[PDB]
C-alpha cells in the first residue's frame with residue numbers, strides 16, 4: 001500500500017496496511033488487530049507533517065472521525081469538533097457562521113485532531129489560544145481520557161502528545177473555545193498594515209490567505225511539509241549578542257521575554273535558496289520550506305536538511321530543529337539525530 005497520497009511531500013513508500021477510521025470504535029478495533037499481529041500502528045490525518053524515511057512495517061489509520069458541534073455559553077461559543085475534520089474548512093465555517101477568532105490560522109493543512117499535537121501556529125496565534133480541552137482514547141484500554149488545555153503541556157511547537165503520550169493516545173475530538181469578544185491579532189507581517197478600528201474578521205482572513213497563497217509552495221505542484229524547520233527561539237542574551245553583528249535578523253518577543261529568530265532569514269543569509277540535492281530543493285522565496293522538486297526520495301530530503309542545518313549552524317551558531325515528523329520502518333525517529 002502506497003503512502004504517496006498520505007504524504008504531502010509526495011514521497012512514494014508503502015505501508016503494510018492502510019485503513020480509514022470513520023469512527024472511534026472502528027479506530028480501536030483496527031488498532032487492537034494490528035497490534036495483536038505485532039504491527040506498529042500510525043494514526044494520521046492528511047500527511048501534511050510527516051516524512052516517511054523507509055517503507056512502513058505496520059498499519060496506518062487515516063482518522064476521518066467527522067462532526068462539528070457549536071454550543072453557546074454567555075462568554076464564548078464552545079466548539080466540539082471531530083479529529084477527522086479538515087482545519088481550513090473549519091476556519092471558513094466559523095467565519096461564515098458568525099464566529100471570529102480562527103482567521104490567522106486559515107489555510108494550515110491537516111485535520112483538527114493534529115492541531116493539539118504540534119500546536120499549529122501562524123501570524124501570531126497558536127492553537128493553545130482557542131483550545132479548551134482535548135478528547136482522546138487510551139488505545140490500549142478503550143478508555144476515553146479528556147485532557148484540559150493545561151494537562152496538554154503546550155509549548156512552541158509542542159505538546160504532551162509529542163512525547164509522553166504519542167504512542168498511547170489517539171485524538172478523536174478537540175474542544176475549541178472561541179470568545180464572543182474578538183481581539184484582532186494584527187501582529188505579524190502585512191497584518192501590521194491594518195488599523196484595529198477599521199478591521200473586520202473577514203479582511204484579516206483575506207490578508208492571511210493572500211500572504212500564504214503567494215509566498216508558500218502549493219503541494220499540487222511542489223511536494224512539501226510547509227516550513228521544514230521550527231523558527232529558533234533564543235533567550236534575550238543569546239539574541240542580543242547576535243543582533244550586535246547582524247542587527248535586523250527579523251525577531252519577535254515571546255510572552256516570556258524570549259526571542260524568536262526568523263529561520264527564513266538565517267538560511268537565506270547562507271545563500272542556500274534554490275539548492276537542489278537530488279530532486280529535493282530549498283524553495284526560492286520561502287527558504288524554510290524544503291520541497292520535492294524533481295522526484296525526490298527521502299535521503300535527498302534528509303541530506304539537504306542536514307546541509308541546511310550545517311551551513312546555518314556554522315555562519316550563525318544557531319542550530320536548527322525540524323518541525324516535520326520523521327517516520328522510520330517501525331515507527332518515529334529523532335529528526336535531529338537523523339539530520340545531524
Ligand SMILES: Cc1cc2nc3c(=O)[nH]c(=O)nc-3n(C[C@H](O)[C@H](O)[C@H](O)COP(=O)(O)OP(=O)(O)OC[C@H]3O[C@@H](n4cnc5c(N)ncnc54)[C@H](O)[C@@H]3O)c2cc1C
Pocket residue numbers: 008042043044045046047048049050063083108109110111112113114115117118119120121122169170171172216217218219224225226227325
Ligand atoms: C503548505 C503547508 C503549510 C503548512 N503550514 C503550517 C503552519 O502554519 N503551522 C503549523 O504548525 N504547521 C503547518 N504545516 C504542517 C501541518 O499542516 C501541521 O503540522 C498539521 O497539524 C498536520 O496536519 P495533519 O493532520 O495532516 O498531520 P499528520 O502529518 O497526518 O500527522 C502529524 C503527526 O500527528 C499524529 N496525528 C495526526 N493525527 C492524529 C490523531 N488523530 N491522533 C494521534 N496522532 C495523530 C501523526 O501520527 C503524526 O505524528 C503546513 C504544511 C504544509 C504542506
